[PDB]
């Protein structure tokens, strides 16, 4: 089998730390002594503002260099082009980006859904009347789950899409929800928008005893929550990456010693997306390893490597690449990593964290099969 294995890396705007985590996972693999060995050789494009034109260029450039798989990120503007070219051409996508519920061939989604976790929490707290503040940046899957469970179980929901809100609109909205005696909230937003809302909640003085916030994010620990600690509003969230396992700790010993100029973003600990990104590299490694144990000499000679070729010429061995990827089962910074036939994370787990005066404390954890098991 060959000494190198060729992959794509496709990163978007504001992904320094993720790219750091990708470069490290590939460096340590390429220099590991651990006991059919190979070097991972990346071909990288960072496309700034992510849009279908830029994502097709990057893809086609990487498809023409002979990559067998592409580690890639997307947003709502590029997800469908990138998944659609991958599934057309039989190149697999390994991605930390937001999951979709429908409908994935050739796409391997490291990021687990927050849907199940989020709905079991609303049950436990017995939430009837609440506001759902959201944006469409990671799709509509959460919003549908919520408005269906409102209909199914007879709740009341104030569901507002906060995309394109300026800062008064938040205060104006929080004022109007003040007058309706609205105290309980689920917020489900992209991180930059979350931080802003949290500032706005504070300005209004709604960060105190009485008020409740469930934050649909996978890195509760990375949210700066000082004024809510003091104010005394009850705030709950999730945390995928469990720092006290020895696998994460081992990584953190390295991460702490990294040179900040080589590896920007290593000055703070890894966000859930950075941790997924390293896990992605470990999944690509395990998969090539298992293909060699299966005795399949995958290559992309002398296939044309033009992505707009008519007739479309899918990669014949792409099928085995895909099938093996979806059977992977290994441990990573995000805990046990495996997937189902449709490529989505399964048998995964994440901690539940509650904000108290001591700071954020683990009150339990949620696993997709066992559901919520409290402490």
């Amino acid at each position: 089998f060959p000494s190198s294995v060729q992959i794509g890396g496709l990163f978007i705007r504001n992904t320094d730390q993720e790219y750091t985590a990708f470069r490290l996972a590939i460096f340590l693999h390429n220099t590991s002594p651990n006991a059919a060995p190979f070097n991972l050789v990346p071909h990288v494009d960072n496309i700034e503002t992510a849009n279908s034109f830029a994502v097709t260029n990057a893809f086609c450039s990487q498809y023409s260099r002979g990559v067998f798989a592409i580690f890639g990120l997307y947003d709502k503007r590029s997800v469908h082009t990138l998944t659609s070219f991958c599934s057309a051409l039989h190149i697999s996508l390994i991605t930390p980006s937001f999951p979709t519920e429908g409908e994935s061939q050739f796409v391997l989604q490291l990021r687990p859904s927050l849907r199940g976790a989020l709905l079991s929490l609303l049950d436990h707290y017995e939430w009837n009347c609440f506001v759902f503040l959201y944006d469409t940046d990671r799709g509509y899957s959460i919003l549908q789950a919520i408005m269906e469970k409102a209909g199914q179980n007879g709740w009341h929901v104030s569901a507002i899409c906060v995309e394109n809100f300026n800062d008064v609109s938040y205060r104006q909205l929080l004022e109007e929800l003040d007058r309706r005696q609205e105290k309980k909230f689920v917020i489900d937003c992209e991180i930059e928008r979350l931080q802003n809302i949290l500032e706005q909640i504070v300005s209004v003085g709604k960060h105190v005893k009485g008020y409740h916030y469930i934050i649909a994010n996978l890195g509760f620990k990375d949210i700066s929550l000082e004024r809510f600690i003091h104010g005394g509003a009850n705030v709950t969230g999730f945390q995928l990456v469990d720092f006290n396992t020895p696998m994460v700790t081992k990584l953190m010993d390295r991460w702490k010693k990294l040179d900040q100029r080589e590896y920007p973003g290593s000055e703070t600990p890894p966000k859930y997306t950075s941790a997924l990104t390293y896990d992605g590299v470990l999944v690509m490694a395990e998969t090539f390893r298992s293909l060699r144990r299966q005795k399949i000499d995958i290559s992309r000679r002398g296939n044309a490597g033009d992505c707009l070729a008519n007739p479309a010429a899918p990669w014949g061995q792409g099928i085995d690449m895909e099938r093996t990827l979806k059977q992977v089962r290994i441990q990573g910074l995000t805990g046990n990593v495996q997937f189902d036939h449709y490529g989505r994370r399964v048998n995964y787990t994440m901690d539940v964290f509650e904000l108290k005066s001591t700071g954020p404390r683990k009150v339990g954890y949620w696993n997709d099969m066992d559901k919520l098991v409290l402490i």
Binding site: N51, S52, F53, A54, T56, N57, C60, S61, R77, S78, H80, T81, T83, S84, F85, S87, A88, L89, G102, T136, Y140, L143, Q144, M147, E148, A150, G151, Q152, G154, H156, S158, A159, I160, C161, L308, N310, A312
Partner: protein, 351 residues
């Protein structure tokens, strides 16, 4: 003579018949307008990208076509980056996107205005994950503002018994048309608002509803001269020769296709009358180099103002219809009748 692209869905036979008839109607010999057709699954971004790229390669000056929610970014990004104008009857994007000429009127404001007209505060909203959730967001945002009690069930990938216990008397249907029939059945007194622009476009009347009230919207007004004149030709075309023709009606998307042809054609007559010449392709070139006369074509398209099957046709600077009328319709025992209109400045109007 001007070559253009056409991107049709493979099941879109009536609309291609309306396109062919428009080409004949709107020609004069002063330039040949000459279509290049591709048929394809418009849900597939890879296929749509290929088709766009074949077209750019040959030298289309504009492209007529379609998209759905999975391919809308392919189109708007490629057209936006390369400065190729796209004219379409597909669902209009929320935001602004240069080089996109949206033939289809926005339905939301008229929908919202109609709910306020009937004074509904409780209502059930049945919606479709396959078509996109753009309108459901608008109504949920308005319900939060106006303290409406909106019970919102997905029926697009029984719901019968949940309707009863929750007990919602009004219903808004924002689904594919085939499903509309099935859902009335489960329930068989009630009130229905059909959330689309062709209330009379397929099955209706004796759907049936059991004598319920039905409201809906129509952009094509068969009392107009142009429309009844058009239908006199359409209704007598040979169906073997023009599939989906030889009928008393036309689907709204087919009417917008025929209107498209007029707008493209008028935009190019404007450039000749103003003496602006246009001449003379790689999708993946780097850096991207948009063709230089594209801006002039876009500007001419948005400056078009004509009448056609969908009423007054005019665009703002972001390619969205303005100054349109949507007729408000009810199903009377006699037949679908026009109880009024939502106009683009005056909102809902009786008589």
């Amino acid at each position: 003579s001007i070559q253009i692209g056409g991107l049709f869905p493979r099941g879109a036979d009536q609309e291609y018949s309306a396109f062919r008839v428009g080409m004949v109607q709107f020609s004069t010999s002063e330039f040949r307008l000459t279509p290049h057709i591709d048929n394809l699954e418009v849900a597939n971004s890879f296929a749509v990208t290929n088709a766009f790229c074949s077209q750019f390669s040959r030298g289309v000056y504009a492209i007529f076509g379609f998209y759905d929610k999975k391919s809308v970014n392919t189109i708007t990004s490629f057209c936006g980056t390369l400065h190729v104008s796209f004219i379409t009857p597909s669902f209009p994007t929320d935001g602004t996107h240069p080089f996109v000429i949206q033939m289809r009127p926005d339905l939301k404001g008229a929908l919202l205005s109609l709910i306020e007209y009937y004074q509904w505060d409780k209502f059930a909203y049945l919606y479709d994950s396959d078509r996109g959730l753009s309108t459901l967001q608008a109504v949920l945002d308005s319900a939060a503002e106006k303290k409406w009690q909106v019970t919102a069930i997905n029926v697009g990938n029984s719901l019968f018994q949940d309707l009863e216990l929750k007990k919602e008397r009004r219903v808004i249907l924002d689904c594919e048309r085939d499903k509309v029939n099935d859902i009335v059945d489960q329930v068989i007194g009630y009130h229905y608002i059909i959330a689309n622009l062709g209330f009379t476009d397929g099955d209706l009347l004796k759907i049936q509803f059991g004598g319920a009230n039905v409201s809906g919207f129509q952009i094509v007004d068969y009392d107009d001269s142009l429309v009844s004149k058009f239908i006199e030709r359409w209704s007598t075309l040979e169906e073997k020769e023009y599939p989906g023709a030889h009928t008393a009606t036309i689907k709204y998307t087919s009417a917008l296709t025929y209107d498209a042809v007029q707008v493209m054609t008028e935009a190019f007559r404007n450039l000749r009358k103003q003496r602006i010449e246009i001449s003379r392709g790689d999708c993946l070139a780097n850096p991207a180099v948009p063709w230089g006369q594209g801006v002039e074509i876009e500007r001419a398209l948005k400056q078009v103002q004509v009448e056609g099957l969908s009423g007054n046709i005019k665009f703002d600077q972001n390619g969205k219809r303005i100054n349109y009328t949507i007729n408000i319709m009810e199903l009377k025992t006699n037949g679908p009748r026009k109880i009024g209109y939502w106009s683009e400045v005056d909102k809902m109007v009786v008589t």
